[model samples]
Target chain A: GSGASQFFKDNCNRTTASLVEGVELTKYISDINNNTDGMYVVSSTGGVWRISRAKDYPDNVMTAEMRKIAMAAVLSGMRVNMCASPASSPNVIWAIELEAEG
Target chain B: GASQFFKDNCNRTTASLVEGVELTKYISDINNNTDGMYVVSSTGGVWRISRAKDYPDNVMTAEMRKIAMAAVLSGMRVNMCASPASSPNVIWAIELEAEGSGS
Candidate 1:
């Protein structure tokens, strides 16, 4: 649908690889720590750490269905990420917006 | 921002008034259509013609916010109808995403 299509367009256009290019992954770790609410970072190698709201974690989680569809779209070469959480726990949290790179 | 679009298109004063009505109906219909159904409006009053049994009455603003947020995060635009055709109101439509699907 055009909605998903437009979402893809905004994701690709809004997030540029260059934005995250040279910044250390640790910086993202820091940003998540300082700006979001009730966030935890699960890194492939760094393990997971809970960042309290006082630290400001970006609200970026997508619903399971949203994640499913988004992941499928990414599989087709469209990039997406789950970066936040639902106000509730036990639900997958993280941003589910598109990105320029994997 | 999407709500902002509605505000802008319909004029904030008129939009807010319409949004109030739409939001009220949106919550009521959600309560009534438990199974859930897609809703579309064009100046015509609200219609809950599909999937009538799954509606849930006590829907909170937060849930509506989540639904609206989900749509925006998915890059979809939601239009709130202001008056409704049956009442000589301007036309507007709100499309709900299928259970797990985006509209």
Candidate 2:
């Protein structure tokens, strides 16, 4: 799955990596302070992205699975591959999709 | 086509299974302690993986165990295996590369 959500539909710009590209995700720490609550992500390429539960959609929060996958990738040095869309920044992208390789 | 490629080259391959079946399942701890180290995923899949390594080196730690659990919970399709020397059931070879604008 692309992992992009309805929130990413028309409200933002998007980008993605193919399976062959082997794009890895890094530094997944929630500004919500790591509880699957906050709005944030600091990556190697995609600088920093913040997705607020209140600002985006209360029901559309990042899942624990997504967080753990990215975190594990970081700890194990396994690269995370993902697709994302951000508003107002090229250095930062709000993710619509995420994948990991370990 | 797969698995043995890792066997021939890698001294330590990510532990995984694929020969007998084309299916994937969950994994977790068995004894609730850490003897032989077999475990079952809280995700409740029938498949299981046994823990390896002599000690703190390659053996799964509590933190990684947590990550593995959360991975399965988040539906990321977690695979449980050992490292290079201790690694058994050598499986897939997945290439992981982080994206960049290309400096």
Candidate 3:
């Protein structure tokens, strides 16, 4: 039997306990699921998102060194943006990006 | 006289040091003297020399801004590294450039 590509979406609610500043379900949905194909949309909210067989995206391609450098720069007041693509294929999971500001 | 020039230079350099001015400023002040001037620094166990008068205008301004931005973003608690140059004149001052980091 063949399984269909899992597609899921949810309205994420924001709470005071969330790490992100602006919490909106629509924005989260649009951002997390944008430009992605052949991947599960999975549940999204204030908690962790569960995606199975999700296509790793560009941001996921970040190496340990790159991540360290990015985090260090962010902590040191340098704004950073990242994108990742899967190693096996050019597919990306979540093209989520972040910016830093003083 | 060379003596007067040296004395004036020494006085200015001393004043700059006492005021806790950066090395760039100190070198600039020295370059203002009539005599030829240069600044030296050690990196990677090698001596690097630069003449203040010959310094690249674009790079100096960009470097200063990079350090300033890094200090502001890190709240003065993080060590800053110079991002490699992207193009001949463009350097990645911060991790994100496409999106303005709100200054």
Candidate 4:
């Protein structure tokens, strides 16, 4: 991960993931389906993402708390950028960064 | 309705009150539809400490929002508590600490 690399790309460890930038977080909720107790979040621009707290994974994946923190900012009207794996629905968030401006 | 809304929701309620957390992000808006004070903690925690955009609102809530904003911009530590699981992100109480500032 270079200084030029996107945070989400670096965190997701995937080269082909989709990035959602400068979007507001509209909602967040518990992901009751998984035992690890992940979360689901929505963007103001209609992005639905899941933070999968997989049972066992590498260290690079963003933790559930990190995703919640990011979601909290978005829910509070802060702008954020998110990186997700697969570049499609049923995506899992890999990285989240808060931006200074709207 | 009635005077029931006048009561402080945080009064004697069992909730998680965390203190000495640094606020990494904060925002306050004046719009009624979007009036709120929200903050994210250095530990990756988020809480909404105030929302008073219209009438029938708590004046203290509005004031508290400004207090949270100042704490974030000043790099001051905060003491905060969550509303409940029903509004997990909502913060019912907050206090700013300025202990580290140099005179």
Q: Which model scores highest in lDDT?
A: 4
What does chain B score (TM) in every candidate? 0.25, 0.30, 0.24, 0.66
- Writing each residue's lDDT as its tens digit, candidate 1 over B16-85 gives 3334222111111111112121222222233322111123522332244345434433434354544443
Q: Which portions of model 2 show Cα errors greater than 4 Å? A: A1-21, A32-39, A51-62, A88-102, B1-103
Ranking by TM-score: 4, 2, 1, 3
Interface RMSD score of candidate 2: 16.4
TM-scores, one per candidate: 0.24, 0.31, 0.20, 0.41
Best by DockQ: 4
For candidate 1, write residues A1-99 as lDDT tens digits.
212223222323433211111111221222434444433334334433333221211111122223333433324343333332234442232223322
Q: For candidate 3, write residues B1-103 as lDDT tens digits.
A: 1133333453443221111111110011101111111111111010111212234744554344344333333333211122222111122121222222232
Q: Write the per-residue lDDT of candidate 3 for residues A13-99, one digit (tens) a residue.
A: 111111222111111122345455332222124322211231232122222123332334334433222222333332222211122
What lDDT does each candidate get?
0.30, 0.33, 0.23, 0.53
Q: All models, DockQ values? A: 0.02, 0.02, 0.02, 0.03
- Model 4 ranges with Cα > 4 A deviation: A1-14, A33-38, A56-61, B1-103
Superposed model 3: Cα runs more than 4 Å off: A1-65, A70-80, A87-98, B1-72, B75-103
